[PDB]
Design a protein around this motif. Structure first.
Motif, PDB file in Angstrom:
ATOM      1  N   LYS A   1      28.210  27.621-102.975  1.00 35.04           N
ATOM      2  CA  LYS A   1      28.866  27.643-104.289  1.00 35.04           C
ATOM      3  C   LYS A   1      27.984  27.265-105.475  1.00 35.04           C
ATOM      4  N   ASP A   2      26.732  27.026-105.183  1.00 31.59           N
ATOM      5  CA  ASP A   2      25.784  26.605-106.229  1.00 31.59           C
ATOM      6  C   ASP A   2      26.193  25.324-106.890  1.00 31.59           C
ATOM      7  N   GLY A   3      26.674  24.379-106.074  1.00 33.36           N
ATOM      8  CA  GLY A   3      27.044  23.040-106.463  1.00 33.36           C
ATOM      9  C   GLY A   3      26.084  22.020-105.910  1.00 33.36           C
ATOM     10  N   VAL A   4      26.600  20.781-105.886  1.00 33.00           N
ATOM     11  CA  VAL A   4      25.863  19.634-105.413  1.00 33.00           C
ATOM     12  C   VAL A   4      26.821  18.789-104.605  1.00 33.00           C
ATOM     13  N   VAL A   5      26.485  18.473-103.376  1.00 32.42           N
ATOM     14  CA  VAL A   5      27.295  17.572-102.548  1.00 32.42           C
ATOM     15  C   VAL A   5      26.685  16.201-102.457  1.00 32.42           C
TER      16      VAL A   5
ATOM     17  N   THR B   1      29.665  18.390-107.373  1.00 28.88           N
ATOM     18  CA  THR B   1      30.882  19.210-107.213  1.00 28.88           C
ATOM     19  C   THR B   1      31.656  18.932-105.959  1.00 28.88           C
ATOM     20  N   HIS B   2      30.996  18.437-104.909  1.00 29.35           N
ATOM     21  CA  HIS B   2      31.554  18.269-103.585  1.00 29.35           C
ATOM     22  C   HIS B   2      31.197  16.866-103.093  1.00 29.35           C
ATOM     23  N   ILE B   3      32.097  16.211-102.395  1.00 28.82           N
ATOM     24  CA  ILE B   3      31.888  14.864-101.881  1.00 28.82           C
ATOM     25  C   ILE B   3      32.312  14.826-100.422  1.00 28.82           C
ATOM     26  N   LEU B   4      31.387  14.501 -99.545  1.00 30.06           N
ATOM     27  CA  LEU B   4      31.605  14.362 -98.102  1.00 30.06           C
ATOM     28  C   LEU B   4      31.624  12.880 -97.774  1.00 30.06           C
ATOM     29  N   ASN B   5      32.780  12.389 -97.364  1.00 28.90           N
ATOM     30  CA  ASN B   5      33.027  10.971 -97.081  1.00 28.90           C
ATOM     31  C   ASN B   5      33.087  10.791 -95.595  1.00 28.90           C
TER      32      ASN B   5
ATOM     33  N   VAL C   1      37.484   4.596 -96.721  1.00 26.21           N
ATOM     34  CA  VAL C   1      37.010   4.627 -98.131  1.00 26.21           C
ATOM     35  C   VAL C   1      37.811   5.664 -98.878  1.00 26.21           C
ATOM     36  N   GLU C   2      38.410   5.272 -99.984  1.00 25.52           N
ATOM     37  CA  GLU C   2      39.207   6.191-100.750  1.00 25.52           C
ATOM     38  C   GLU C   2      38.423   7.240-101.451  1.00 25.52           C
ATOM     39  N   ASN C   3      38.964   8.418-101.576  1.00 25.37           N
ATOM     40  CA  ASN C   3      38.443   9.454-102.456  1.00 25.37           C
ATOM     41  C   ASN C   3      39.060   9.213-103.827  1.00 25.37           C
ATOM     42  N   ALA C   4      38.295   8.782-104.801  1.00 24.52           N
ATOM     43  CA  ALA C   4      38.809   8.186-106.010  1.00 24.52           C
ATOM     44  C   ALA C   4      39.142   9.166-107.096  1.00 24.52           C
ATOM     45  N   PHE C   5      38.635  10.396-107.086  1.00 24.92           N
ATOM     46  CA  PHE C   5      38.726  11.318-108.216  1.00 24.92           C
ATOM     47  C   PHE C   5      39.202  12.653-107.762  1.00 24.92           C
ATOM     48  N   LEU C   6      40.420  12.663-107.237  1.00 27.47           N
ATOM     49  CA  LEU C   6      40.928  13.808-106.506  1.00 27.47           C
ATOM     50  C   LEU C   6      41.024  15.096-107.315  1.00 27.47           C
ATOM     51  N   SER C   7      41.191  15.005-108.583  1.00 25.57           N
ATOM     52  CA  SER C   7      41.255  16.211-109.430  1.00 25.57           C
ATOM     53  C   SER C   7      39.927  16.717-109.852  1.00 25.57           C
ATOM     54  N   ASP C   8      38.847  15.973-109.597  1.00 21.05           N
ATOM     55  CA  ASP C   8      37.567  16.210-110.208  1.00 21.05           C
ATOM     56  C   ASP C   8      36.512  16.789-109.327  1.00 21.05           C
ATOM     57  N   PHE C   9      36.676  16.747-108.030  1.00 21.54           N
ATOM     58  CA  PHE C   9      35.702  17.168-107.030  1.00 21.54           C
ATOM     59  C   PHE C   9      36.410  17.796-105.861  1.00 21.54           C
ATOM     60  N   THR C  10      35.700  18.591-105.083  1.00 25.06           N
ATOM     61  CA  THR C  10      36.138  19.072-103.805  1.00 25.06           C
ATOM     62  C   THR C  10      35.725  18.030-102.771  1.00 25.06           C
ATOM     63  N   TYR C  11      36.654  17.497-102.007  1.00 22.56           N
ATOM     64  CA  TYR C  11      36.408  16.463-101.018  1.00 22.56           C
ATOM     65  C   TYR C  11      36.545  16.936 -99.596  1.00 22.56           C
TER      66      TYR C  11
ATOM     67  N   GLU D   1      29.113  22.268 -92.064  1.00 23.39           N
ATOM     68  CA  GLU D   1      29.973  23.302 -92.688  1.00 23.39           C
ATOM     69  C   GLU D   1      30.173  23.016 -94.146  1.00 23.39           C
ATOM     70  N   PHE D   2      30.636  21.803 -94.400  1.00 23.94           N
ATOM     71  CA  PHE D   2      30.944  21.400 -95.770  1.00 23.94           C
ATOM     72  C   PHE D   2      29.743  21.307 -96.709  1.00 23.94           C
ATOM     73  N   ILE D   3      28.656  20.762 -96.213  1.00 23.38           N
ATOM     74  CA  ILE D   3      27.411  20.732 -96.950  1.00 23.38           C
ATOM     75  C   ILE D   3      27.027  22.139 -97.344  1.00 23.38           C
ATOM     76  N   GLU D   4      27.110  23.076 -96.397  1.00 23.88           N
ATOM     77  CA  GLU D   4      26.767  24.479 -96.682  1.00 23.88           C
ATOM     78  C   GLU D   4      27.733  25.112 -97.641  1.00 23.88           C
ATOM     79  N   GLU D   5      28.970  24.746 -97.674  1.00 29.57           N
ATOM     80  CA  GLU D   5      29.930  25.211 -98.698  1.00 29.57           C
ATOM     81  C   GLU D   5      29.430  24.884-100.067  1.00 29.57           C
TER      82      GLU D   5
END
Length: 147
Positions: A84-88, A35-39, A44-54, A76-80
């Motif tokens: 949210k019960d997602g996966v980073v 659900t979440h991507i920490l770059n 490096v581009e974030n390739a799927f902007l509509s699909d994940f929280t970056y 901070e972001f990892i804990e977000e």
């Protein structure tokens, strides 16, 4: 270069570590319930902007980079994602140095575990890790003032 297959490491049920190829592999991001991507690379581009929280934090993989100084924004972001019960997915370029150091430090910070134990957990999950020697030494020192 051209896209290749990748193998992410599982650090927590909700925390993955990998490469930019993993970040650019929609098939596996889906399968892995990301659900979440920490770059934490540079450029490096974030390739799927509509699909994940970056979240992108620019970091250079150099021994003089102070990896400790990027920890709050990353953690901070990892804990977000966890809250949210997602996966980073935490990634960088190769995902063996910057990104590895971020996750090692996240374990040390969040659970007060030692460098040696955090490192071993991460390397067992992702045997290709190989943080630059600056990051290594920085991590060994991290939070020793609280002893």
């Amino acid at each position: 270069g051209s896209h290749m297959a990748s193998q992410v490491g599982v650090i927590k049920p909700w925390l993955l570590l990998g490469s930019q190829d993993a970040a650019h592999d929609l098939d596996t991001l889906k399968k892995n319930k990301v659900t979440h991507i920490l770059n934490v690379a540079y450029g490096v581009e974030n390739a799927f902007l509509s699909d994940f929280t970056y979240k992108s934090i620019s970091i250079l993989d150099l021994p003089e980079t102070n990896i400790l100084s990027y920890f709050p924004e990353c953690f901070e972001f990892i804990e977000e994602a966890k809250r949210k019960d997602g996966v980073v997915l935490v990634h960088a370029n190769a995902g063996v140095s910057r990104a590895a150091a971020i996750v090692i430090g996240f374990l040390m910070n969040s659970e007060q575990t030692s460098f040696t134990s955090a490192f071993s957990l991460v390397k067992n999950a992702r045997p290709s890790i190989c943080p630059n020697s600056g990051f290594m030494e920085q991590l060994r020192t991290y939070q020793e003032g609280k002893e």
